[PDB]
Write an enzyme that holds these catalytic residues in place. Structure first.
Site, PDB file in Angstrom:
ATOM      1  CG  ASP A  82       5.666   5.702   1.556  1.00 22.71           C
ATOM      2  OD1 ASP A  82       5.771   6.594   2.450  1.00 22.71           O
ATOM      3  OD2 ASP A  82       4.611   5.112   1.254  1.00 22.71           O
ATOM      4  CE1 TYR A 107      -3.465   7.591   6.973  1.00 23.73           C
ATOM      5  CE2 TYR A 107      -4.890   8.625   5.356  1.00 23.73           C
ATOM      6  CZ  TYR A 107      -3.627   8.504   5.932  1.00 23.73           C
ATOM      7  OH  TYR A 107      -2.612   9.289   5.515  1.00 23.73           O
ATOM      8  N   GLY A 132       0.819  -1.243   0.000  1.00 25.74           N
ATOM      9  CA  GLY A 132       0.000   0.000   0.000  1.00 25.74           C
ATOM     10  C   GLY A 132       0.830   1.260   0.000  1.00 25.74           C
ATOM     11  CG  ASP A 147      -5.372   5.636   1.440  1.00 24.81           C
ATOM     12  OD1 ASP A 147      -6.135   5.166   0.550  1.00 24.81           O
ATOM     13  OD2 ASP A 147      -4.177   5.398   1.557  1.00 24.81           O
ATOM     14  CG  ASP A 148      -2.543   9.748   2.057  1.00 28.14           C
ATOM     15  OD1 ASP A 148      -3.024  10.145   3.130  1.00 28.14           O
ATOM     16  OD2 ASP A 148      -1.439   9.189   1.975  1.00 28.14           O
ATOM     17  CD1 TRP A 185      -1.469   0.846   6.629  1.00 26.90           C
ATOM     18  CD2 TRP A 185      -3.133   0.669   5.157  1.00 26.90           C
ATOM     19  NE1 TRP A 185      -1.011   1.316   5.432  1.00 26.90           N
ATOM     20  CE2 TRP A 185      -1.996   1.182   4.494  1.00 26.90           C
ATOM     21  CE3 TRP A 185      -4.316   0.547   4.448  1.00 26.90           C
ATOM     22  CZ2 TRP A 185      -1.990   1.492   3.146  1.00 26.90           C
ATOM     23  CZ3 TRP A 185      -4.332   0.924   3.122  1.00 26.90           C
ATOM     24  CH2 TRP A 185      -3.171   1.344   2.471  1.00 26.90           C
ATOM     25  CD1 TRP A 186       1.697  -0.120  13.073  1.00 29.88           C
ATOM     26  CD2 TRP A 186       2.989  -1.869  12.651  1.00 29.88           C
ATOM     27  NE1 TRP A 186       2.815  -0.007  13.863  1.00 29.88           N
ATOM     28  CE2 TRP A 186       3.635  -1.071  13.620  1.00 29.88           C
ATOM     29  CE3 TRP A 186       3.638  -3.032  12.220  1.00 29.88           C
ATOM     30  CZ2 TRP A 186       4.878  -1.362  14.164  1.00 29.88           C
ATOM     31  CZ3 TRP A 186       4.854  -3.349  12.794  1.00 29.88           C
ATOM     32  CH2 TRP A 186       5.472  -2.536  13.729  1.00 29.88           C
ATOM     33  CE  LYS A 199      -2.328   5.565  -0.980  1.00 32.62           C
ATOM     34  NZ  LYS A 199      -2.571   4.299  -0.279  1.00 32.62           N
TER      35      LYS A 199
HETATM   36  C1  1XI Z   1      -3.882   4.228   4.761  1.00 31.49           C
HETATM   37  C2  1XI Z   1      -2.457   4.668   4.606  1.00 31.49           C
HETATM   38  O1  1XI Z   1      -1.616   4.411   5.482  1.00 31.49           O
HETATM   39  N1  1XI Z   1      -2.192   5.453   3.545  1.00 31.49           N
HETATM   40  C3  1XI Z   1      -0.897   6.069   3.284  1.00 31.49           C
HETATM   41  C4  1XI Z   1      -0.420   6.910   4.470  1.00 31.49           C
HETATM   42  N2  1XI Z   1       0.983   7.202   4.312  1.00 31.49           N
HETATM   43  C5  1XI Z   1       1.501   8.365   3.944  1.00 31.49           C
HETATM   44  N3  1XI Z   1       0.731   9.398   3.621  1.00 31.49           N
HETATM   45  C6  1XI Z   1       1.397  10.636   3.210  1.00 31.49           C
HETATM   46  C7  1XI Z   1       0.817  11.865   3.891  1.00 31.49           C
HETATM   47  C8  1XI Z   1       1.367  13.100   3.610  1.00 31.49           C
HETATM   48  C9  1XI Z   1       0.831  14.249   4.187  1.00 31.49           C
HETATM   49  C10 1XI Z   1      -0.222  14.158   5.060  1.00 31.49           C
HETATM   50  C11 1XI Z   1      -0.741  12.939   5.396  1.00 31.49           C
HETATM   51  C12 1XI Z   1      -0.243  11.789   4.782  1.00 31.49           C
HETATM   52  S1  1XI Z   1       3.223   8.296   3.798  1.00 31.49           S
HETATM   53  C13 1XI Z   1       3.263   6.616   4.461  1.00 31.49           C
HETATM   54  C14 1XI Z   1       1.862   6.045   4.231  1.00 31.49           C
HETATM   55  C15 1XI Z   1       1.533   5.448   2.870  1.00 31.49           C
HETATM   56  O2  1XI Z   1       2.416   4.356   2.578  1.00 31.49           O
HETATM   57  C16 1XI Z   1       0.085   4.959   2.877  1.00 31.49           C
HETATM   58  O3  1XI Z   1      -0.311   4.539   1.569  1.00 31.49           O
END
Ligand code: 1XI
Ligand code: 1XI
Ligand code: CA
Lengths: 714, 708
Positions: free
Chosen positions: B342, B280, B133, B240-241, B335-336, B164
């Site tokens: 990344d 989330y 993910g 998400d995101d 989801w840990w 993603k």
């Molecule tokens: C459900 C879930 O975990 N989704 C994402 C969250 N996330 C990240 N998000 C980036 C972010 C940037 C700015 C504000 C909030 C989130 S980076 C690591 C992880 C990414 O692997 C993952 O798919």
């Protein structure tokens, strides 16, 4: 170290002069403009005034140096140089002599200050320089521009262009003009050679396919005329390493004399006309002596005849040069085959220049070095040959070697010395030529180790020397890799520098094994050494992958044998003490070979590109009825062919050659006679195992000259 | 150690039997064929009808295990396993349970011997596995085939496909069926997942451009139907995101319930239906709570809801999981976000799995890990998450880490432990998430350094501890580089292994500098260290050059700071003792910056991609008339632009450019409030100079961009 090459006559006073703030320059408009340009660069941002320190520059006869005409040596390229508090004198016997006075002047200048000095100087040998004459990748255009500047600084007046693999020089296109791109590059090299007082000598190598007819004679002269149009004013014809009609000495002499009479003597301004004979060394000369005496007696005497010494690769002796000179009726123009590495392409040859008699200047017309395909790396030898050729009577091999290294890489001179000290021998080769390497540490090595194989404690200092040597090797490797002062030098030597660092790491670990106090620590160092062996294999398989001697060998004379023998010994002793079965092999080999043939079973496998081969044996092989050899590769590969040579130039009636992917199901493969050996095509058949069995009822006596599997390239 | 995950109940008799050379098998035709295949591969030995110990395999209800049916735990994926002199029993509560009895059995088998044991086992958490993910390069097909085999071995029953950056997963091409090549690969992965008792969950991420209309609803159902045709039987929708209308929780719940009613409940054989919310994690969620209560109230109860904890990157606590569960009205499907790297792409995260409450199995529907883009490197954490999720009550962080490493690289396990111990922290990052590293040596490091700096004598043992560490680091680096047991692992880690070896060599030379000896020796070590700094700079500037966190960092928490501080200190002491002027700089910088301004001149330059910049200061911006900041690049480069910031709106500075530092061209700075900028239209540049050409005297940013 003060001056290179060292002048014929030098008288220094213990008085030093300032490079004058204000100077009157007398002779600037009439003296050699190449010399005047060097002077003006050295006097940059100083005051030119009609009443300062007098600096006199000119050629003998010029108004500016009339006063000193009695001090100017009467020799070609000679000069008088004077520095005192009254004035400076830079007086050539000729235009090139004035340039050479400035190349000396430049080395005297130490931080704005000049020694009070009297110099009368000239070269002992008339033509001095480099023949780019080797097999392999010709020097780059940028490398050649760098070479010509270096020649001017070291008073080398000759650059003979003749790379064996330039198709417009040799086979098969010597008849064709250079394409526009290459022609423009050659024109620039000629202009740069002229600006550095170097004679660009363009050579042609037409012998393998020349017809002794009008068509080929005219095409050779037409090619010379095109080179003349590019600015070339010296010419050579090479007849070396050819077979067939082109080896005819009467026809060679007739061609050279035609070039002489119709071209060399018809242009107003041709300098050197040089030929390289077919018999270019004493060993490959026919005992009737007729080839060389035919050239000697028929070639016009102004024409130079080149010579490599008593063998293809040899140093020049008084007896050897007397031998040739008696047959060619003129002083030999030496072609010295060092540091050329084109037959040992897995080695760098970075050691000192030695072995040539220092008393025979009057017996040679010229002296050129054939260098490595690594242009910058060759500067060590080139600097040393320049020194030798200019002043052989004062030639100091070891100081000149040090001076060269300090000139080439001042920022890392001790690191380059460390690397070069252990990268100087050629290793075993078909031409039999060797050089000294690692001589300083060799005694501490020989008895840290003949002792270990037998005797006792060996000495705290023959351990601190080897430890110190490995430590210095790693420092040197890492500083050289990161050096930005001579990036082209570092690009050339980088693969060897990697291998040299791994050698030093393996040595440090093997000594930690010898020091080894507990079993656990010992196994950690053992496993580390096995990994370092694998890493050296991968550098060897991925670096310098040419068709002839692929890969990278370093510190081969003393250090690698010391490390390999010490590892095998300390492993034998561990196995004895702990009833263990540790593998004592010193070179990593991913494939395996087994034999019940006494003279084959201990021969190592080698990997060379997509070949897997048994190291050829020196001894007579006794191959019993039913006995066999089997190679197991680390994986299944598509097969290309198997090549075998048993020294019979005959079908092998007694042997069965088979391949398999599993070593259970075998397919027979038929050996066919090909070019005096045996060859079996595999047609891309999957192979992991190769087996050769004596299926006759009789013992066979052969030499294992060749046993090679070729697999499909990556 | 002996079993991973550790079983719920184990009784061992400290007696051994030989794996039977001749055996009788009951239940081969009746039992899960995936289990029977594992057994037959383990049984080096001849099947007999008449001689040898009896092996019984089967599911509850099979005649083969009738005798043992009350011993079988009555739990999904449960099993009973027994070994004694007389017989072996492998008895699942269901087919997947029988396969799991075989994955435990395979671990008991040691040098052709078995322990006498009785096991009753079942998972504490229903869904356990991996969500692919992350942002970045999706796992290769070969990496995914390896992953599914590893999941089956470790009793992970879930793989959620959702990279993603897969354009057929996310916007806008989530609407399009997979091209034929990719479709055939996904069909193979579903078949391999099935052979390893893993549920392949295909996720879609449509929210950034979804229209809440018939057109997009139908295209999403048509895409799920195409995945169903490739064999997919579990599905997810991720929101998400994203920004915009796709964050509407009522429209999200309506779409998931429509999927459930028209697709998940209409097909005969769909298993999981999962959604990832826009909100989330707790911090990211709306303080008014309306979004999460809408999902909890409106989403059909069979639908799982994913959650990453209190923050985007967080460990799961009892208070955290209670907070979400109260709002979504069901146990969260965790989801840990570890070991996902990344957002720290210059770091490998190879340390242990810890921080998640071991008492909350009843509070979670599922637990999946989001890993690194380095698939094999992620197997340390995946193995540990499998152990945790199956038996959280017995979860042993450190023993599980060691067991993972010895499972992944048995040929070089101690070398991989050495590398992983010192490659576990993330370093500073925008999400604030950190992990421990080098904790073994931290006390010796902290002592050694505390001493050395304020001139006391350091313990011989601590110097020795640091020397031993650096020595082990080099051995590990050189053994791992050449390891052929897991080539794909070694490809992933190789850039870091090179940097790790240089770190260890730098350490060894910095310690030889501390031992001091004589001036000429110190200078040799000094010069060697500067070469090793340079080599590290070149790895960091040339390896892993991604747009986000380029380069390669290793041993960052303890070891590199120790080495850099010890170097700067021993050089300060040597300079004093010999009034020398050796450079104490720890980061190599090929460019030079000379300034006759005060709070500027000592600011290090930094190189990042095609940028050369002065480190911003939080100090005194006081600049005398006629003074200059001058940068000398190591060569001429085409100039792209310069950006300069002082932190005010505003004519005292002349920005000039040169290839030789004699002939100078002027460049005029445009102005948008604080932001001073000038394009250089590919102008040659080697020197950059900013002079104060004013009567009077007077650094948020000073950044030159060049062409790479
Ligand atoms: C459900 C879930 O975990 N989704 C994402 C969250 N996330 C990240 N998000 C980036 C972010 C940037 C700015 C504000 C909030 C989130 S980076 C690591 C992880 C990414 O692997 C993952 O798919
Ligand atoms: C005049 C001259 O030196 N020509 C050659 C000789 N030589 C070599 N020749 C190859 C050879 C093979 C077998 C028998 C004799 C000679 S190898 C090194 C050098 C090569 O650089 C050079 O151009
Ligand atoms: Ca059944």
């Amino acid at each position: 170290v003060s001056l290179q090459p060292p002048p014929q006559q030098l008288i220094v006073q213990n008085k030093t002069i300032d490079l004058p703030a204000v100077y009157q320059l007398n002779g600037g408009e009439e003296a050699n403009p190449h010399a005047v340009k060097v002077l003006k660069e050295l006097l940059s941002g100083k005051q030119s005034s009609k009443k300062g320190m007098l600096i006199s520059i000119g050629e003998k006869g010029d108004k500016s140096v009339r006063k000193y005409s009695r001090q100017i040596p009467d020799h070609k390229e000679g000069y008088y140089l004077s520095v005192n508090e009254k004035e400076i004198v830079l007086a050539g016997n000729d235009e090139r002599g004035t340039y050479y006075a400035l190349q000396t002047f430049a080395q005297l200048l130490k931080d704005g200050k000049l020694p009070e000095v009297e110099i009368k100087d000239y070269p002992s040998v008339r033509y001095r320089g480099v023949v780019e004459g080797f097999y392999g990748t010709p020097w780059s255009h940028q490398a050649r521009l760098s070479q010509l500047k270096f020649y001017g600084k070291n008073k080398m007046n000759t650059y003979i262009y003749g790379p064996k693999d330039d198709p417009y020089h040799s086979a098969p296109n010597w008849r064709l003009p250079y394409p526009d791109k290459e022609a423009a590059q050659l024109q620039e090299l000629v202009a740069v050679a002229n600006e550095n007082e170097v004679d660009f000598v363009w050579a042609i190598h037409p012998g393998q396919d020349i017809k002794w007819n009008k068509e080929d004679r005219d095409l050779l002269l037409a090619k010379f005329e095109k080179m003349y149009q590019l600015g070339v004013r010296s010419f050579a014809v090479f007849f070396d390493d050819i077979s067939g009609e082109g080896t005819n000495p009467q026809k060679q002499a007739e061609l050279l004399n035609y070039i002489d009479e119709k071209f060399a003597q018809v242009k107003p301004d041709i300098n050197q006309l040089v030929m390289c004979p077919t018999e270019y060394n004493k060993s490959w000369s026919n005992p009737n002596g007729n080839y060389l005496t035919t050239l000697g007696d028929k070639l016009n005497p102004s024409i130079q005849i080149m010579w490599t010494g008593d063998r293809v690769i040899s140093d020049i002796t008084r007896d050897g040069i007397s031998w040739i000179n008696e047959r060619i009726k003129r002083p030999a123009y030496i072609w010295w085959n060092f540091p050329v590495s084109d037959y040992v392409r897995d080695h760098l040859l970075l050691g000192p220049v030695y072995g040539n008699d220092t008393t025979i200047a009057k017996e040679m017309s010229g002296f050129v070095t054939n260098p490595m395909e690594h242009a910058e790396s060759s500067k060590i030898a080139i600097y040393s040959v320049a020194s030798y050729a200019w002043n052989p009577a004062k030639y100091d091999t070891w100081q000149t070697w040090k001076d060269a290294i300090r000139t080439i890489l001042p920022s890392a001179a001790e690191e380059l010395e460390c690397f070069a000290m252990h990268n100087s021998d050629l290793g075993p080769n078909g031409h039999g030529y060797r050089r000294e390497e690692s001589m300083d540490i060799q005694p501490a090595a020989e008895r840290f180790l003949k002792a270990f194989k037998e005797g006792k404690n060996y000495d705290k200092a023959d351990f601190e020397t080897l430890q110190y040597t490995f430590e210095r090797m790693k420092e040197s490797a890492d500083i050289l890799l990161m050096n930005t002062e001579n990036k082209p030098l570092i690009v050339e030597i980088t693969p060897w520098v990697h291998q040299f660092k791994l050698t030093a790491e393996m040595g440090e670990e093997v000594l930690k094994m010898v020091e080894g106090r507990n079993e656990s620590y010992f196994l950690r160092k053992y496993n580390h050494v096995k990994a370092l062996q694998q890493q050296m294999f991968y550098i060897d398989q991925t670096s310098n992958q040419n068709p002839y001697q692929p890969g990278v060998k370093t510190a081969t004379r003393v250090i690698k044998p010391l490390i390999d023998r010490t590892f095998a010994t300390v492993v034998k002793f561990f196995n004895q003490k702990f009833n263990a079965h540790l593998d004592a092999t010193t070179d990593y080999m991913p494939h395996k070979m087994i034999s019940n043939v006494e003279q084959i079973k201990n021969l190592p496998l080698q990997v060379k590109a997509n070949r897997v081969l048994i190291s050829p044996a020196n001894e007579v092989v006794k191959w019993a009825a039913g006995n066999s050899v089997e190679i197991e590769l680390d994986a299944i590969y598509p097969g290309e062919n198997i090549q075998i040579n048993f020294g019979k130039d005959a079908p092998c009636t007694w042997g069965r050659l088979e391949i398999s992917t599993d070593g259970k199901e075998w397919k027979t493969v038929d050996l066919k006679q090909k070019e005096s050996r045996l060859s079996a095509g595999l047609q891309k058949a999957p192979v992991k195992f190769v087996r050769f069995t004596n299926v006759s009822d009789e013992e066979q006596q052969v030499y294992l000259r060749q046993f090679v599997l070729t697999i499909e390239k990556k």
